[PDB]
Structure 1
Amino acid sequence: SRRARIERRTRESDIVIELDLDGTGQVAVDTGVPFYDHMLTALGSHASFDLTVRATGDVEIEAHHTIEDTAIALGTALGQALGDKRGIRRFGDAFIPMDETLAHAAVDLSGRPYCVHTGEPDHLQHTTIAGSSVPYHTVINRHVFESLAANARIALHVRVLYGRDPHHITEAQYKAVARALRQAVEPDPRV
């Protein structure tokens, strides 16, 4: 059994994560940041995890703290659920084409904690994805991946090969991480 429940309570936020690595994409994410919900829902589903995320934070300031605390907690949940990491595929990668965008992620689940994030166009450093609720600043993409990798204690390399639309660029990256994780997480019948 590869499950983890993480409860993270800070001054900024209140997080509950329930994670099953061997799931069927049963995902419910509620952080108060709907685009982030969309991204983590995509992450959970495409990784074929079962994932519940319940988060309430200081979104009056902005999404940052909640986003970061959630990523930390999710990272911790991933590492805990992984356990000894014996007999797994360990390495995984995936390409995600999304209209004009092509993104890629590669992981080593038993490698030293590390994150390299490259290729993301410069305008995503100051782009806001905004709806009727709390907005999402795409500059946080790197932060999410770094927080995930550091707390799951994995090597995570995320690349944007090319792209234009910030929604496409961001979603393709989350999905790339997701499917890279899904491959690496699988039992390896020869290891």
Structure 2
Amino acid sequence: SRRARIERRTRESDIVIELDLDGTGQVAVDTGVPFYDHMLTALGSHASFDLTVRATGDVEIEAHHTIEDTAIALGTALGQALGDKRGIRRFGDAFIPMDETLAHAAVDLSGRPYCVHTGEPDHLQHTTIAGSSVPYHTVINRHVFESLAANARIALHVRVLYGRDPHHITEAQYKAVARALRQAVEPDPR
């Protein structure tokens, strides 16, 4: 079994992650940042992980610290769950069309952090996705992928080929990471 439980308590946040790589998309995410909840639920579900995330942090400041602590904890869990990485596909990639948006992610697990994020339209460096709760600043997308890659110790390449809507651009990237991971972690029959 490829399960990990990570507890991460900092001055800024309190995180619990329970991750199973060999899941059916049983996913529950509650961080206090509802758009981030949606993105991590999409990630767990499209990866066919079982994933629970419970995070409380300093959202009076903004989402950044909670988002980052969550991504660090989640990456740590992914790395621990992967163990020796013996017998897995190792390489994975996925294209995700979302209406006008096309995103792609490619991964190499096998143990050296690296993240390359390209093609995200420049308006996403100062876009806010806002509802009735704590908002999500899309400039953080890159930071989430970097933190994941750095703590899981994997190579993660995330690309936006084109798109316009910041919700479509963001969600397609999270889904692309998710399906790339799904393919990479699967047993390689050879």
Q: State TM-score, norm by structure 1.
A: 0.99
Secondary structure of 1:67's partner? helix
Structure 1 residue 171 displacement after superposition: 0.1
What do residues 129-158 of structure 1 show as CA deviations (whole Å, max 9, x unaligned)? Answer: 000000000000000000000000000000
Distance 1:95 1:147 in 2: 22
Structure 1 residue 10 displacement after superposition: 0.1
Secondary structure of 2:66's partner? helix
Q: Which moved more, 1:180-189 or 1:110-119?
A: 110-119
Structure 1 regions of 5+ residues with no counterpart? Answer: none
Q: Does 1:56 align with 2:56?
A: yes
Distance 2:12 2:96 in 1: 33
Structure 2 regions of 5+ residues with no counterpart? Answer: none
Secondary structure of 2:97's partner? strand
1:36 maps to which residue?
A: 36
> Structure 1: which 4+ aligned runs deviate by more than 2 Å?
none
Structure 1 residue 111 displacement after superposition: 4.9
What do residues 12-49 of structure 1 show as CA deviations (whole Å, max 9, x unaligned)? Answer: 00000000000000000000000000000000000000
1:100 maps to which residue?
A: 100
2:175 maps to which residue?
A: 175
1:134 maps to which residue?
A: 134
Structure 1 residue 112 displacement after superposition: 1.7
Distance 2:161 2:152 in 1: 25
Distance 1:27 1:133 in 2: 21
1:73 maps to which residue?
A: 73
Q: Which moved more, 1:102-111 or 1:22-31?
A: 102-111
Distance 2:41 2:111 in 1: 26
Q: State TM-score, norm by structure 2.
A: 1.00
Distance 1:46 1:189 in 2: 22
Distance 1:111 1:10 in 2: 25
